[PDB]
Design a protein around this ligand. Sequence first.
Ligand SMILES: O=c1[nH]cnc2c1ncn2[C@@H]1O[C@H](COP(=O)(O)O)[C@@H](O)[C@H]1O
Ligand SMILES: O=c1[nH]cnc2c1ncn2[C@@H]1O[C@H](COP(=O)(O)O)[C@@H](O)[C@H]1O
Ligand SMILES: *Cc1c(COP(=O)(O)O)cnc(C)c1O
Ligand SMILES: *Cc1c(COP(=O)(O)O)cnc(C)c1O
Ligand SMILES: CC(=O)N[C@@H]1O[C@H](CO)[C@@H](O)[C@H](O)[C@H]1O
Ligand SMILES: CC(=O)N[C@@H]1O[C@H](CO)[C@@H](O)[C@H](O)[C@H]1O
Lengths: 830, 830
Amino acid sequence: ISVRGLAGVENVTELKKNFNRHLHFTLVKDRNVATPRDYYFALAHTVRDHLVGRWIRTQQHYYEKDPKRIYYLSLEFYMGRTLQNTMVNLALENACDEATYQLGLDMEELEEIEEDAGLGNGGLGRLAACFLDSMATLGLAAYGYGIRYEFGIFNQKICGGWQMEEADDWLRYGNPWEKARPEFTLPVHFYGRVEHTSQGAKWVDTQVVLAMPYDTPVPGYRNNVVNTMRLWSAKAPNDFNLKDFNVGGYIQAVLDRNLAENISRVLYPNDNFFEGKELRLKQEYFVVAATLQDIIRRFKSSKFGCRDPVRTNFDAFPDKVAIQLNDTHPSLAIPELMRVLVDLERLDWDKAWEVTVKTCAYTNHTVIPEALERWPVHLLETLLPRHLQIIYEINQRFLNRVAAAFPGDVDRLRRMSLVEEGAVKRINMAHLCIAGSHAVNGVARIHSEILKKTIFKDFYELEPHKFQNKTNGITPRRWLVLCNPGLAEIIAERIGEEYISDLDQLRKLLSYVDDEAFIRDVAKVKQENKLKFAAYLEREYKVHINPNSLFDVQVKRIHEYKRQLLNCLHVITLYNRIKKEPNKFVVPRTVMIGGKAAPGYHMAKMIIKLITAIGDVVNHDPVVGDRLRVIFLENYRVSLAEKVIPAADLSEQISTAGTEASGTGNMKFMLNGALTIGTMDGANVEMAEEAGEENFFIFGMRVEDVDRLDQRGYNAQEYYDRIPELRQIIEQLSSGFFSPKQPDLFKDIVNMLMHHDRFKVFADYEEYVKCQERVSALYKNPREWTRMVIRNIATSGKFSSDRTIAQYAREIWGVEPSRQRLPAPDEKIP
Amino acid sequence: ISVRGLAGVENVTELKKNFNRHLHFTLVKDRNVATPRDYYFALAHTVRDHLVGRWIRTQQHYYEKDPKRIYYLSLEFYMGRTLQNTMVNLALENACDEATYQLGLDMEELEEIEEDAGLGNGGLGRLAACFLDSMATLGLAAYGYGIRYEFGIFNQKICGGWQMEEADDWLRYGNPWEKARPEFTLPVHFYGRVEHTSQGAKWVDTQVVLAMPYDTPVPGYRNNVVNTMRLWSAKAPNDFNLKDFNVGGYIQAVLDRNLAENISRVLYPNDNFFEGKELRLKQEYFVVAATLQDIIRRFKSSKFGCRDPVRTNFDAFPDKVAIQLNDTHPSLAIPELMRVLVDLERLDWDKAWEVTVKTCAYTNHTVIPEALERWPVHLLETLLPRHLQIIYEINQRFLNRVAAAFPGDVDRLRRMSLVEEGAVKRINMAHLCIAGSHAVNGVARIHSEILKKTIFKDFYELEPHKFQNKTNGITPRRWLVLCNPGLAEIIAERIGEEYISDLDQLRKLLSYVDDEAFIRDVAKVKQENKLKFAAYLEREYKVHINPNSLFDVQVKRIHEYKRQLLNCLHVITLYNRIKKEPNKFVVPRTVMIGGKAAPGYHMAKMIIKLITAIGDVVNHDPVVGDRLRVIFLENYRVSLAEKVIPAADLSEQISTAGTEASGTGNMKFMLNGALTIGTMDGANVEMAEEAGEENFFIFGMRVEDVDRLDQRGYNAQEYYDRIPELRQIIEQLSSGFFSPKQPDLFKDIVNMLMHHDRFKVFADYEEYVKCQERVSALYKNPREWTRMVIRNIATSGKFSSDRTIAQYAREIWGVEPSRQRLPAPDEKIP
Ligand SMILES: O=c1[nH]cnc2c1ncn2[C@@H]1O[C@H](COP(=O)(O)O)[C@@H](O)[C@H]1O
Ligand SMILES: O=c1[nH]cnc2c1ncn2[C@@H]1O[C@H](COP(=O)(O)O)[C@@H](O)[C@H]1O
Ligand SMILES: *Cc1c(COP(=O)(O)O)cnc(C)c1O
Ligand SMILES: *Cc1c(COP(=O)(O)O)cnc(C)c1O
Ligand SMILES: CC(=O)N[C@@H]1O[C@H](CO)[C@@H](O)[C@H](O)[C@H]1O
Ligand SMILES: CC(=O)N[C@@H]1O[C@H](CO)[C@@H](O)[C@H](O)[C@H]1O
């Protein structure tokens, strides 16, 4: 059937009865009233059964051996569905497929019922999920720590061409993967004040919110290692949240509990944008405060909570603990670690600081100013008074370090301060993370260099040793084996299976680049994938596309820097050229653009309306025929990505050079047989470098050109004046060609494009369409297109998150990865 | 070990492995980290497994045979713990005791971990729970329908002698008994307006709240019947509760979902008191609207949703459906049934009314005015506009019936109206229920007569056939076999086991009233029970009592009508007499008073403070010694009741004649070997009548005397003037003898007692203490005390809820009870 494992005789039989056990005993249903949803859960529970045994021994193991622990703190974990992924990592896919088949059910139909775990916005959240999978696969004693939002990223609905947001109630029917652990609930404090008494400061008169943990299993790939993702939920104490007496109402007091519990209610839907709301700040401290208590408790036990030197010596803390900051969101972990060590454990400042710096590491994910966290002091002042005092003291000591290093450099001092003066004082969370971490890293080579040259230049001059790079990656399991079994099978037919956990081996595929059978196969799976997607489209969304055309897709969050607008300009151009010479042949294309716009991002929502507007015109022009279709992919999310990416021919990664830190979607397309048209931005550079620039469609300004242009000054009018095709498009938008009933509907987009384009869309237009002509030329030559594809696939190995994690492990955490199978799952009951 | 069933070889082995399965696979724990709470859940899940098989076949059965269905609507279901009760009804107690013993665990210790299902206030809520157990035991196709509050009755804490309320988070660790059924979620409407168009009225522009059901199994006693209790939970739709666009905030919109979900958040802690809050009204319509859709859906299928006359003829509705209104709380079921039939199904008014009256039955539970539901019209007007119109139309037609029956009786017309004029117009829910039901019943013979003679006199003259009586009862399973196995065993030793489901057989115990061994045994179990309670007291609450003294206990909600104050006066008297003649012998007593006071009931909370105040003085007076102890039983609830009642010697049922509808606690004490001192009120009359007034301690005013006194006019001063002992007590309270630091602390109680005692406490004082002297005299004669006890126990049979249900069944519902074992639980998988 494929290498989805063995469909053993004993195990298919075993699976079937357990499926039935659960349907009866767990779901309390009988075959006669069971619906597809019931069947999905019976299966889910049956599969979950297979990893609890391994989950328990893995955790017990780490307790016995006591290795260094890795704590990945992130406010986002974009997990997606977990049924299939679990089957794949446990080698259960074929057995389950067989068993469910014998029970008369279609496994694929059941898999579509699972709701996505959308606890993330986009790239940052998904990176965390791929990292968790890789850390498990590499046998690291790692823990993912986050917030269990009851409402993840909103579900996007397109009404009249506009995006409509609606709550994502992903828990509505329950989550069979998580295990509530109310017995490990911890208290988290807010507000209050600071008392300075005799031997130390005291955080007093605080409001308490309880943090209840929920554990979700994270299975490594076929190694019997099952790590843990612990998500915190907010709960109101039953005392003060009722007991602070003297009139108000008993009923009201109970109803007001949903005020402390609102902390973990919903994820902020912002991607690369900072919103300074108090609720956000509360979520940030909440996950930090609860997680740290968990970290220290585990440390206090270790082998120190037995003997060792005997005396809670936190000197070995950094040898046993490593906490990674996914962006600045969990940045309060630094001052909180200090608070606990100094205030509670009573360590002297300097010893406490040494420990803190040695265990913390920060990962930066963007360079755009509006995405940078700068919290107003009055907020920290009210909500976390002691932390503000600690931050000021950290700043004081740090600046003294700077002054001593650069005597008389008074401007440098204000520039490096963690405290920003002005309208309202703010705290630069990024500066805090650099100062309190022993390593700071970028997510792609150019992004890392930009940090050193630009944004954190002064910090780099002060401590050059801190700055590193760790190019992002993606997991070959979900992003190849899971979403594209067809391609994985033909690859395995030639080079085996060891590449799934050793992607570098894909290079061996280079020697089949001239193999006639392979070329035919690679081309066959892609055709099957396009056919399956073309079907899904009419199935679930309804209104035909042509599977023979080039599948041109750009799927990512809607941003001005991602330039969906630039993609739009090209589409209109294609249309206008066709309308000019109707009877001239052109390579047919289906351009699919999908992504979510943050609810408050007016421009982003305007762009979504433009895309649908273009499709209204283009898709109903008889002269165009089936040569050009414009489709907006609705509710783009992980599960949808697993469907489009394998069916894509052209991947669009066209951000303005220097704005996309790394990107990961690009990698997803490269490993799945799509060719890339893009700018020298983020990881695109390392990808082209790995496949060879001849097998990539690079165009536009490099970072240097962008800067040259900024010195000069960017004037869009120039481009408007010298390019008639471009002029024609702008006047089409301005006159209502794309919005008849509301002719001035797109005035904001035009106005912006002409007068305040921060991402110089016009500057890359000419080279972009020129380049698009080149891909169309190559598509006309199937054999050569496929051979170039083989060149990309065979060379994508470097982009596996196993590589990224292995580097974090060795160069930052100080631990050694291991591909050693944990001693089976085997029963056992001590 | 006892007759807790057989501890079979095969089944104890089977139990043990399943216990282990769950501990591993369900709880995801290993023996080395498992805590008593974990063990409790492993067991709970193991036990729950045994009734899912029976649950499924019972429900399938009713679908096949299609008998008349009984729907018990109540806003309260005081369930308590359910582990032991399930073992008892499934004959699993000894096997589980054995198995857990072999696993090295104490079952009793694990049973104490289960949280109480406190979805009720007191008697009304508990009646519903005993009814459910009886309906299952009598094989009725019955369904309990209510609200799944996430916060039940508050947990009571005594701080400085005062009651402190704190949220009852009973779901904190989960509920292993319920089964969420999100797939059967139904919509419920609120607000909106009424449109009158061409062919009918339309309820429009409403706010929608979703009702998600949760099913809990209700096992009959050893008959393999497992009925269902369906509890509704409020959920916000994800559309409008987000989709009603045009600024407000996306985040705020999601946070505001907890506004529609607040409907099922907390139970109103009022006992026999009406609070006209909008939230309450919403809860009332919510349970009614959701339940009815469920009822009609089931009816539409039946055997009509196949063939029958073919044409949705609701003429057979009353033949297939019976809905019982537990008080007026679910009274909106009447106009709602009309709305659906008329507005949606399009039946003519008269045919719809005929059906409605024929399927609805109302049970009244109190005669005090402040407990009567009278909803302001402006509220119904805003929240349920169409229902108000239907109520006015019902009133219109009803009053026309009255006018035609009593021509010219204009006062009668205003008196019987469902609409009350005055300050603000109100709707008398009780009048609504009488008019729209074919049967109205009281809960005790005297209470029923009072309804006919007083409160509903006019209604009785109009339709005498509607009024009936159904004396309350309690379930012998939980209230004898479960809480008092010792007594059940010795009874079974002589007369067998058939009495558990046929309590009348207890009469056979009359012939052992002179049996020397029996007298010794009955006396032995009571001594063991008192010893076990005396221990629990020091275990969980701490500060000694004497097991040889008479256990004088009064446990029920704190009310002015229950007269805990009268009990207080006696206690102080005992104290004062002892202080007068210290070296005179008196029968030692431990008087235990426990109960919860509604949060807003100032007087009730003042009484709790008085009780503790008396104990502070009495319990620390060296002269008193161990002859008199005053203890306030904290957090009285079902699980605590299962502990005190079996250990009681004297049961206090001293309400003012004519105020306690029936009472049920009294019955609980009678069946467990306690003697009763009380007034001729509620079921006390039928109890004394059943055991013989010679075996009961009756005192005080009868209903007639109370009325005589009211004609005359009640003057407490008279009693104060003629009774020195009484005068002495009042002056002790007035001068601060019981409240040194705050001498005027009890001025409200004294002021009330002397000037506004609605329940004439002083009027029954003399006869009360006189009577108390008689019980003390009899206690001095162990042999005769026990023989009188045997006379009560042997004669309590009539007070089993099986008897009550059998009567409801035959005289109201039109169904025949059956003690036929359902065809085993046996596997099966169609
Ligand atoms: O005190 C202990 N004795 C034995 N095993 C322990 C103990 N504490 C933790 N463990 C094991 O380690 C796992 C880890 O627990 P953690 O503290 O949540 O990381 C537990 O489920 C146990 O298997
Ligand atoms: O359409 C049907 N076919 C077969 N069995 C049914 C059907 N509808 C209800 N049942 C059975 O009756 C039980 C009652 O469902 P209810 O409608 O919630 O009372 C279900 O769990 C099934 O066993
Ligand atoms: C991988 C992924 C992302 C990241 O896309 P980029 O092109 O790097 O912005 C965002 N959303 C989803 C659902 C993804 O799977
Ligand atoms: C039976 C019961 C009641 C009813 O007591 P009465 O004496 O009838 O008022 C109230 N509370 C609990 C917990 C009960 O078990
Ligand atoms: C702040 C933020 O979300 N940054 C995003 O992080 C992901 C994962 O590193 C990058 O691939 C992406 O380019 C970048 O925009
Ligand atoms: C309104 C109300 O709660 N009434 C209560 O109902 C229970 C059960 O019928 C009676 O025993 C009790 O005397 C009465 O006070």
